[PDB]
Structures are given as C-alpha cells and as structure tokens.
Amino acid sequence: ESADLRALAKHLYDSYIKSFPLTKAKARAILTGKTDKSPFVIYDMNSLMMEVAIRIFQGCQFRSVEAVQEITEYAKSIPGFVNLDLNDQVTLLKYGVHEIIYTMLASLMNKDGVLISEGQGFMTREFLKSLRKPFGDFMEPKFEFAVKFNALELDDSDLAIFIAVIILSGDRPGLLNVKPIEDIQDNLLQALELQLKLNHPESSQLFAKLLQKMTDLRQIVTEHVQLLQVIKKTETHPLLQEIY
Amino acid sequence: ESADLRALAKHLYDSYIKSFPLTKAKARAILTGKTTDKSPFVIYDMNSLMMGEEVAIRIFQGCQFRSVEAVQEITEYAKSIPGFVNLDLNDQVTLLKYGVHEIIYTMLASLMNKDGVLISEGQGFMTREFLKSLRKPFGDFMEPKFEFAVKFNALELDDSDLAIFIAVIILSGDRPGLLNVKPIEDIQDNLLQALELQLKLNHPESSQLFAKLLQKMTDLRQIVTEHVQLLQVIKKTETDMSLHPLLQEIYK
Numbered sequence: 001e002s003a004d005l006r007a008l009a010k011h012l013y014d015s016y017i018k019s020f021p022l023t024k025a026k027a028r029a030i031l032t033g034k035t036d037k038s039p040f041v042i043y044d045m046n047s048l049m050m051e052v053a054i055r056i057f058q059g060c061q062f063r064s065v066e067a068v069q070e071i072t073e074y075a076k077s078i079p080g081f082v083n084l085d086l087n088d089q090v091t092l093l094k095y096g097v098h099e100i101i102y103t104m105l106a107s108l109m110n111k112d113g114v115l116i117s118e119g120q121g122f123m124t125r126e127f128l129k130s131l132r133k134p135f136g137d138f139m140e141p142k143f144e145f146a147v148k149f150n151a152l153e154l155d156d157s158d159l160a161i162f163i164a165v166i167i168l169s170g171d172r173p174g175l176l177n178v179k180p181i182e183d184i185q186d187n188l189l190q191a192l193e194l195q196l197k198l199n200h201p202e203s204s205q206l207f208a209k210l211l212q213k214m215t216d217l218r219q220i221v222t223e224h225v226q227l228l229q230v231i232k233k234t235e236t237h238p239l240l241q242e243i244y
Numbered sequence: 245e246s247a248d249l250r251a252l253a254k255h256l257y258d259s260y261i262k263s264f265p266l267t268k269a270k271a272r273a274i275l276t277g278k279t280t281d282k283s284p285f286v287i288y289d290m291n292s293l294m295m296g297e298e299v300a301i302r303i304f305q306g307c308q309f310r311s312v313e314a315v316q317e318i319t320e321y322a323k324s325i326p327g328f329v330n331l332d333l334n335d336q337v338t339l340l341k342y343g344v345h346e347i348i349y350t351m352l353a354s355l356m357n358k359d360g361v362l363i364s365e366g367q368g369f370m371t372r373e374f375l376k377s378l379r380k381p382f383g384d385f386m387e388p389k390f391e392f393a394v395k396f397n398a399l400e401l402d403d404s405d406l407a408i409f410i411a412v413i414i415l416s417g418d419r420p421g422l423l424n425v426k427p428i429e430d431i432q433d434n435l436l437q438a439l440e441l442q443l444k445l446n447h448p449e450s451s452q453l454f455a456k457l458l459q460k461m462t463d464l465r466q467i468v469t470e471h472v473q474l475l476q477v478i479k480k481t482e483t484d485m486s487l488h489p490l491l492q493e494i495y496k
C-alpha cells in the first residue's frame with residue numbers, strides 16, 4: 001500500500017529534521033550555494049589558529065560523539081526499532097554509526113572542503129591533505145566518496161530513508177534475531193524506492209545506484225577503522241580516554 | 245519498453261550458458277539427491293585426497309589454475325554484454341580487473357553448500373572441514389567464501405538471474421581509474437532495468453529481492469578485500485610459491 005510507505009517517508013523525514021541540526025539543504029546553501037554569513041575558512045595553519053593535526057583529530061572525535069547521539073535518537077524513531085531485542089539495537093547502532101557518519105558527512109562536503117562547527121566554518125581539502133603523515137590520509141578517502149555520492153543529488157527526504165536502511169541491516173555480527181530487522185529493512189527499502197521514484201522521476205535506477213554506494217561506503221569504514229588503530233602508535237586526559 | 249529488456253535478459257542468459265561450462269542448474273543437480281548419474285567423489289581427508297587423483301600448496305595451485313580459467317570464461321562473457329567491446333580499451337581492462345574476482349566468488353557460491361564445494365568440473369567434492377584444516381593460513385582461505393555462499397544461496401537465484409547480475413557487476417563505473425564513466429553508467433542502467441524486471445518476473449513473491457541482491461555487492465567487495473590481504477601474507481611466508489602473472493596483474 002502506497003499509503004503506509006509515504007506515511008513512513010514523511011515520518012522519517014520529520015524525525016531526521018528534528019534529530020540532525022545541520023541539514024543537507026542548509027549545508028548546500030552555505031557551500032556551493034552562496035547564501036547570509038559565509039563560513040570562516042581554514043586553509044592553513046594561521047587560519048586554523050584563528051598542536052594542529054592532533055587537535056584537529058580530537059575535534060573530529062568530539063563531533064563524532066555528538067553525531068552518535070543524534071543518530072541514536074533518530075534510530076529510535078524508526079518504526080519497530082525500539083521493539084527489537086535490546087542487544088540487537090545496540091549491535092545495529094554500534095556497527096551502523098560509522099557508515100551513517102560518512103554518509104551524512106557528504107552533505108557537508110564539496111570537492112574543495114568540508115563544513116565544520118554547525119556550518120560556521122569551512123576546512124579546505126588541501127589543508128587536510130597537508131597534515132603530518134598519518135593525519136593527512138584521514139579525510140581524503142572520505143572526500144573521494146563524497147564527490148561520487150553527491151553526484152546522486154539526493155535531498156534530505158531521500159537521505160532520511162537511506163540512513164534508516166543502513167541502520168536496519170541484518171548482517172551485523174552478533175545479532176540475535178535477524179528476522180524482524182530484515183522485515184523492517186524490507187519495508188524501508190520499499191519506502192525508499194517509492195520516494196526516489198516520486199522525488200526523482202527522471203533519474204533512472206537511482207534506487208539501484210544508491211544501494212551500490214554502500215559497497216564503497218563499507219570499504220571506507222573498514223579502511224578508516226584500520227587507520228584509527230594506527231594512531232594508537234603515534235601519541236599514546238583522563239576521563240577523556242573514556243569518553244572516546 | 246519491457247520487451248527490449250526481456251530480449252536483453254535472454255541474450256545474456258544465452259551468452260552465460262555458452263561461456264560458463266558448469267551452471268548453477270548442473271551444480272545443484274550434482275549436489276542434491278537428484279541426478280545420481282554423476283555423483284561426485286568426495287575429498288574429506290588426505291587419503292581420500294589421493295584416491296581422487298605439500299597438501300596445502302598443491303590445492304592452492306590447483307585453485308590458481310581454476311582462477312586463470314575463470315578469468316578467460318568471464319572475459320568471453322564480458323564481450324557479449326551489449327556495448328562492452330565498444331568502450332575505450334583501457335576501460336574494458338579496468339572493468340575486468342576489478343570485476344573478475346567479485347564474479348568468481350558470486351559464481352563460486354553456485355558450487356557450494358554449507359558442507360563443501362564442487363571441484364574438477366563437478367566430478368569431485370571437497371569438504372569445507374577439510375579445507376579449514378589445511379596448514380598455516382591456507383585453512384583461512386576458503387572459509388569466508390563459504391560464509392558468503394550460504395547467505396548468498398538463500399536468495400535462491402537461478403542462472404537466468406545470475407547472468408544479468410554478473411553483467412551489472414562488470415559494468416560498474418565507480419571502478420577506480422576509469423576514463424569515461426558516462427557510457428559505462430548508461431550500459432549499467434540498462435542492465436539494472438533488465439535485472440529488476442527479471443527478478444520481478446522470476447521471483448514474484450520475493451519482496452525486494454532486487455535490493456537484497458544489490459546489497460550483496462557489499463559482501464563481495466569485502467571478500468575480495470580480505471582475500472587480497474591473505475595473499476600478501478601467503479607470498480611472504482612461502483617464498484617458493486608462485487602466483488600467475490595474470491592474477492598478479494589483476495591485483496594491486
């Protein structure tokens with residue numbers, strides 16, 4: 001029934017808006033859209049100031065922890081999610097949040113850099129590439145993914161449903177009851193397909209193209225966690241370890 | 245029009261049957277009760293292994309050979325995909341380089357069940373437990389392929405579905421280093437329309453099978469990525485082990 005599918009779409013859109021402060025629509029206005037208060041631009045060490053690589057890294061960590069809580073709130077609004085086994089809800093968020101972070105990060109990126117701090121700042125791609133060894137390879141693969149992903153020209157109403165699809169995967173390790181998860185994801189996939197078909201009537205197979213982006217996305221996450229483990233041999237703040 | 249898409253699907257199934265000597269139909273026939281006109285000989289230990297005729301490397305070289313053959317069969321198939329041989333020659337190479345192992349592991353699932361895998365064009369059957377028990381790191385080689393295959397075969401796809409899916413894999417366009425992405429995209433969009441119709445027609449009760457199948461491309465990518473890491477280990481522990489130049493060229 002096309003009626004519960006669009007009820008589902010609107011529901012997810014509304015809660016996406018509620019949960020995530022900076023929407024793609026707003027970010028685009030600030031980015032390549034040329035809006036009311038341009039972002040402060042960080043393009044070098046001097047602009048940054050107004051111990052670099054580490055403090056940038058730690059700032060990204062702070063932001064990612066905030067993002068985990070926004071994503072968590074959003075997840076609990078996906079119909080059926082809270083009714084799942086509690087351990088499974090934890091497992092889904094645990095393995096899903098990285099994929100979602102980089103997906104949503106794309107909304108704040110163009111080929112030349114990324115919005116930071118509620119959209120108040122813009123950090124250039126080239127500046128990020130110029131960071132001391134380990135740290136300069138951090139964001140580059142995320143930029144490469146973002147350019148490809150942004151070529152799809154999704155809006156927030158599309159992204160809301162896609163994010164929900166990622167969360168309800170089914171193949172996360174250690175899941176206790178895979179069936180209701182895949183049943184919910186089947187429904188979200190139906191709602192996503194219909195959404196892209198209505199929202200983007202002239203973009204053939206947009207649904208298929210979007211699902212294929214998950215392949216690059218998961219590689220990116222795998223490579224990132226690999227990198228994350230290498231900085232445990234670079235610099236090796238009490239209660240702070242624990243927070244992160 | 246739906247009709248053009250059916251004709252494309254028929255052409256691809258046809259080319260598939262002509263390119264790949266052991267179909268899923270035949271493999272499932274061998275694996276199940278079924279056709280007991282050609283029951284396979286089963287390899288589950290060393291002694292049965294020599295009846296069928298180091299132990300771990302010999303099997304690995306046997307498997308390298310099957311890889312180089314599979315690259316040929318896949319290349320012959322790729323040529324049948326409408327538009328493929330018209331592409332920039334460099335992009336033909338790139339598509340094959342990145343597509344070949346994702347296809348090999350897709351098709352390998354057709355030859356597997358939870359218990360083992362068909363070998364030697366279906367004349368033999370090698371146990372999953374036997375493979376797992378191989379020395380060193382050779383025992384870790386096939387196990388994630390089995391894990392994928394038991395999940396992949398739960399989609400209950402047949403050869404007519406697989407023919408189009410395998411073409412979609414080849415014509416990716418998010419492949420690294422492609423010169424002209426647009427014509428590749430146009431071909432894949434046709435192939436995807438063809439695949440979506442095929443699944444809706446062949447599996448009308450199977451909800452969102454199309455999406456579920458596309459999601460499996462994530463599993464394939466991860467299998468390849470892990471398999472490459474395992475090979476880098478093998479070549480450094482066994483300095484006397486030889487990898488085929490074709491395969492070396494595919495890997496980076």
Ligand SMILES: CCCCCCOc1ccc(C(=O)N[C@H](C(=O)O)C(C)C)cc1
Binds near residue numbers: 308347
């Ligand atoms: C497309 C036809 C599929 C034939 C299936 C062959 O079964 C295989 C299963 C595994 C492998 C495999 O991992 N080969 C490796 C590779 O090519 O990197 C190594 C052994 C050469 C090769 C073949």
